[PDB]
Design a protein around this nucleic acid. Sequence first.
DNA 1: TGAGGTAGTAGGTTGT
DNA 2: ACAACCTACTACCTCAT
DNA 3: TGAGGTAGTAGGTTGT
DNA 4: ACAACCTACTACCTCAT
DNA 5: TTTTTT
DNA 6: TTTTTT
Lengths: 770, 770
Amino acid sequence: MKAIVVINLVKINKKIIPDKIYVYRLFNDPEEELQKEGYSIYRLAYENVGIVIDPENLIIATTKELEYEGEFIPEGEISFSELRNDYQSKLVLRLLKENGIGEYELSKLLRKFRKPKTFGDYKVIPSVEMSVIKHDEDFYLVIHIIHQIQSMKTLWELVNKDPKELEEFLMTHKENLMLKDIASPLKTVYKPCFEEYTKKPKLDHNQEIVKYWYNYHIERYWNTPEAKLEFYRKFGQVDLKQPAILAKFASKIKKNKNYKIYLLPQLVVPTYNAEQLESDVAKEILEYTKLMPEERKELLENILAEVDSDIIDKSLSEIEVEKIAQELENKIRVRDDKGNSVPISQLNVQKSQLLLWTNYSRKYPVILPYEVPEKFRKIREIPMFIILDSGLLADIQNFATNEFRELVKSMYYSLAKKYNSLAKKARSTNEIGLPFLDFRGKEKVITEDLNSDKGIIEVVEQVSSFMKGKELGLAFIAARNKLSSEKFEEIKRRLFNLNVISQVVNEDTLKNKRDKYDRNRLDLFVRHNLLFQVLSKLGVKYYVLDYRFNYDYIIGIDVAPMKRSEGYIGGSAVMFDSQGYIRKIVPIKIGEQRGESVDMNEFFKEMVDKFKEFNIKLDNKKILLLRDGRITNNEEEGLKYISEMFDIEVVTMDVIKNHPVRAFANMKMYFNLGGAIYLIPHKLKQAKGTPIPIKLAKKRIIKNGKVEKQSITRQDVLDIFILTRLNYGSISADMRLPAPVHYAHKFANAIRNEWKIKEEFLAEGFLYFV
Amino acid sequence: MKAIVVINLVKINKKIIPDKIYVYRLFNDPEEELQKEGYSIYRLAYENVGIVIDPENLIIATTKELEYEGEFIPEGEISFSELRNDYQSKLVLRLLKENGIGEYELSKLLRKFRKPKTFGDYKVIPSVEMSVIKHDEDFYLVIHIIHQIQSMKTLWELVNKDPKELEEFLMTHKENLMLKDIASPLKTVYKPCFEEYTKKPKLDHNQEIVKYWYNYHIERYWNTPEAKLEFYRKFGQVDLKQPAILAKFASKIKKNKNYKIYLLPQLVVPTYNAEQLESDVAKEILEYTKLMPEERKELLENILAEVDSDIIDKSLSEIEVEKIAQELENKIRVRDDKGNSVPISQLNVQKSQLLLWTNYSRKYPVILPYEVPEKFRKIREIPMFIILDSGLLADIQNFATNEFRELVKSMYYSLAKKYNSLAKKARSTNEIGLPFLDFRGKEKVITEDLNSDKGIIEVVEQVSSFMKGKELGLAFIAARNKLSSEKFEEIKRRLFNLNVISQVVNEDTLKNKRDKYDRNRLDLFVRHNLLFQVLSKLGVKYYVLDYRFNYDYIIGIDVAPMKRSEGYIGGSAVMFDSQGYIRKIVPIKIGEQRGESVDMNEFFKEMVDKFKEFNIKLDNKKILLLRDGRITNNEEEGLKYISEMFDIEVVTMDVIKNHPVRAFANMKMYFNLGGAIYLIPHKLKQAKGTPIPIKLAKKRIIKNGKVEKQSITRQDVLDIFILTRLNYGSISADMRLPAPVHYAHKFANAIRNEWKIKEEFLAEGFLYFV
DNA sequence: TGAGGTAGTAGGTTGT
DNA sequence: ACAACCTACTACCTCAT
DNA sequence: TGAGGTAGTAGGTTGT
DNA sequence: ACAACCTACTACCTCAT
DNA sequence: TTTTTT
DNA sequence: TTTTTT
Ligand SMILES: [Mg+2]
Ligand SMILES: [Mg+2]
Ligand SMILES: [Mg+2]
Ligand SMILES: [Mg+2]
Ligand SMILES: [Mg+2]
Ligand SMILES: [Mg+2]
């Protein structure tokens, strides 16, 4: 099918294209030839109305003649047609500013129809973001409406000038509080310092220090007789009862991490966080930053109407989109009562209703898991523990215990008996069957304070003592609402170290997610999701795709920052076929690295010993590589080297999720724009908000040490959309990313927290990190 | 016993002690109140004849009145007696320079009796290093004679100006070559850039670039008409046939690692490395930097004789040392023919002659291993592989194969049969016994190019295919001389991943270490060492100490850098007793960190689940903690927190191996100086050189959250000396560091290369990283 | 990389 | 010219009867 | 931390 | 005012007959 | 509802 | 000397 939709793009008149472009080459960084801190090769090319076409060799392209006080050589001339499309778009975007078409102007135009509002102590201000895209031979401007939230009160006029209140404020927001200094014209963000173990802030009470810093702020920046008037009006006199906060830089470009700083809690403001604000106010600050497609369309049309210039057009652009058929969603292969491989279509049911029979067994068909792991043939008995945070009230603890026990016995055991016996065990003897989750007897319910080291030590000691001689166990943790991080991660890591798979539920769910009719029971949605997630963590694949993929492997790659270091960690997820029609999932860990660039040589070496069929078994094996972000130049250069030796053919694509392009409709679709493909694979069930598409770009084929660029066809889009529909963490899931990228992200995040179990469950689809 | 020895210390006249010391406090870094190049708080205190007594708060102590162009406050006055001993010593050292007693003067005085020599293209220059120590109430100056090696030829006049020769030089020293720019007055060191995979340098041939850089060097630094004369005399004209080398900073303080640099191979020199120089010249450059104790004594006495000043004395100092008895070395507990526990004393044999019977069995007693791992009760079968680098000649390959097979069968199997049968298997049935190392049949000898990725892949494939269904194997690798790093480590890591323990021998050993009588056999020393190391890697402890230690555990801690990251890795080694008389070794991995400071909270949490007896079983457990280096303030602060909860008592000591203090004698001894203990535990078997002592300092006791400083007694020194004599990597070993620190270093280095086997052999004494 | 020792080259962290 | 210390790498030299 | 979506705050790497 | 993307964290809102 | 089933 | 011993 097809349709016509309106997108937030406006055409650009061709008269803006420059006639003559000069090219210059520098010999040294402008920051060193001269001495002006902050000056870079990009600022020099910006001030001359130009772009940087070679950052390594310092080669820039300019419209005017270069006005530089250093050393350079002119490399000649160039025409607009000899630049690449990206640089053409960047140059056109730069030229749009010289005609008054800038973000500073369009934001002011927008703020005539949407006014900056004030909620509590914060202000929300609309703004726009502008980009340029070359579709075929015409340039289009992309305008995206965003909001910014700022604080109108300093840290002094927030705690009512009581130092103790400042102490509570600093201590209760220890993890994620940052202070921005507004008295400076750089607006640098700092982080407060805290004492180890004992917590508590690090204040210093000394009048001389505060006097020196206040006078330094006056003298260094506002060094005119006039400016001191607004300095005294904005912040007042030199308050002396205010302590000084120990703080460090939030960034690291300056480096030299011995730079102590003293912050006066009178010239700084908190940045923004809804955790430090009342719920009734956070509800209305939100729902103002989210706009329906119609509101965006009317606002953009008004902005275009109130622009007086020939350069840009007066109406938004319309594009032709290709709709996605409904039949594509219903392409999964579940297994029925007997043990067949019936499509889910021929049961008059949808994927969401997959465990409705376990509570009724009279109105909905009985549906059984498609795949069960191999180690469950020998493993038939699994201990289960219930851990409860002592910070909850007794009624909540009893409710959580009862809910966990009922979930295990009433819901899981029915499936465990209908699968193991009714459909399997042909004559008193079968091999693969669902295990048994004990929870039997006392001393398996642990009630310790999970927010302290002593409680965690006691919990670990108890579980380890009970776990002697065993190899796989399950745990249900009922945690409090305010459980700090580095304690959640610690609990999960120390439980994984004993080969115990854990599932955590927080207090707010146990108190506000009660059922519709029976208000003394957990909601059906939550219970079904919990059972599905536990089954997926135990290695059971409840359904598989009915699609037939043309490749032999599908690999997703992602990179995550380290916890306490300056480095990065790579992670990947690999899906095999062995016929095309059925897939498995195995996570692969790539080593540490210095930047966001995966060493493709070490990845394939690690992907050879973890295999049996090799990458060159008998003939050429085709590999599909989806990259979260973009394929860097080093990754592409290192793929030709692998293709030279291993004799494989790689097809690489880039998946992007943060782009300013929007389509003003609510349906699953895709369209081709600027050489890339924008795909909306999901539908929004909430009233307020606009769906964010997925950008597929830069498809290329590498073989025999050669790279050939290609264009994305319809089959690739259909394959990506099909891979989108494979989620093992939620039955009623409508996600955006494809499965390999989605699970590579989670595996990288798990490695960041050093969550490893046995290295042998990973090979058979155990997904503890899901 | 006792003796009197001469140490390189000279007394200092008390008249130098200052009368009045001023104290000042700054408000901001002098690099920011003003704008200089590298001005710091330490340079400011140096130029005012003073020290920095508080770096965090910027509090400095000065002798003169402070002359500063910024903001500061005087904190009052202080007397010399109120400073700590370290700051008193630093102040006295600073005051020694104002009287002409500096390194620049004493080095010039020394260079009258030792002249700077020239070997090949390098120059060796003597110099001195000076320190100050306060022993009881008098200050002593420590003078240490060192040498410096510099290059008198640029990179241009080293390759005879042939660009191809320059390419060969750059490619053959790719790993460890650095270039220092001598045309600059900062003498900054750079590292050349190379192309990935394909290797080869990164040169740029362009006359304009070389002209610009040469003129920039002339203009920026030597900006006087006179200086250009020596610039033209030193380096010559602007040579134009010289390419430009791509290079980056060797350091990282500047950061911003996109700042490429172009180096002219005419203004830079190699720094120094004996790998790039002829062997006959490297032999004579060495043996000139090493001095016997007598030469050092005469040189220092001459230096003191030719000093005209009252400030320092005219003769070296004499100290009273306590000798170490011979009986202490012979305190190991080996096990005899029957299987008893006789001390090695009652056999008329020494530790080195521990396997002389396996070749004679008629002149020396038969000696059996004390301990054998528990996993060998079930394991009775071990595959053995022989891997040979294809870069060796055929005769060397055959010799290596024959030597490995003979080592396994003639030497090991005799022990394996005398232990398993003659002494064990009382009635046809025993449990613990030595396994069998196959090398059975062909297809267990692998000959592939180990310097390339293809050869490593093939080797891994073959070993993994043969290793199917097994759990422990052994490998002997015969590698070439020039085997580059990152290939050795890769081979070891990929072999460990298959649970194969490897031992590597290089080509130079197989060609020059032939036996005395039979020149077609490997030397006895090398063969015995190889067998001992293999046995230790397999978990067999051939001997244990006869000492009785007063503590329950001994823990050694070390920190190592990361390979591709900016971070650090902690490692530790723990020795248990369970009675005080016997010891086991278990390595413990501490997590990643940002600096050289181990998180003591996470270490003890990891040391609880890896235990069974806990740190608080029934009563107080004493822990001894030896730190490689020094205990940082954060580590000490985090130990009181642990002592508060876990109810343990920790005794911490600092072990230092790089200090300028020397004793002019050759015997095992120790003495007390400046509050620290200097211990010489080994004897030098080479003619040239002086033994380097071990500095034990800063003993302290932590319990109930309280820290009490203590003094090192004789029992602590005896314990450290006894722990020194426990090495499992060499039978004829006389090392310096204690065993826990020595093995913590190796475990940290192994973690740096990610060498992990199964996490279950680690807990029971396997030492694959030794 | 037989392993330990004594010699060099370069760089980093801590201090409190 | 900020002291003390760590780390990585390279080279020779000696070991038991 | 039921899991996914849409909204904010801050920071980093790549380009070639 | 260097684009164009990634990461970490926080908050609400909706889900299957 | 602090289990079954064999 | 590209093994035993059971
Ligand atoms: Mg990414
Ligand atoms: Mg990700
Ligand atoms: Mg989860
Ligand atoms: Mg260390
Ligand atoms: Mg070490
Ligand atoms: Mg070794």
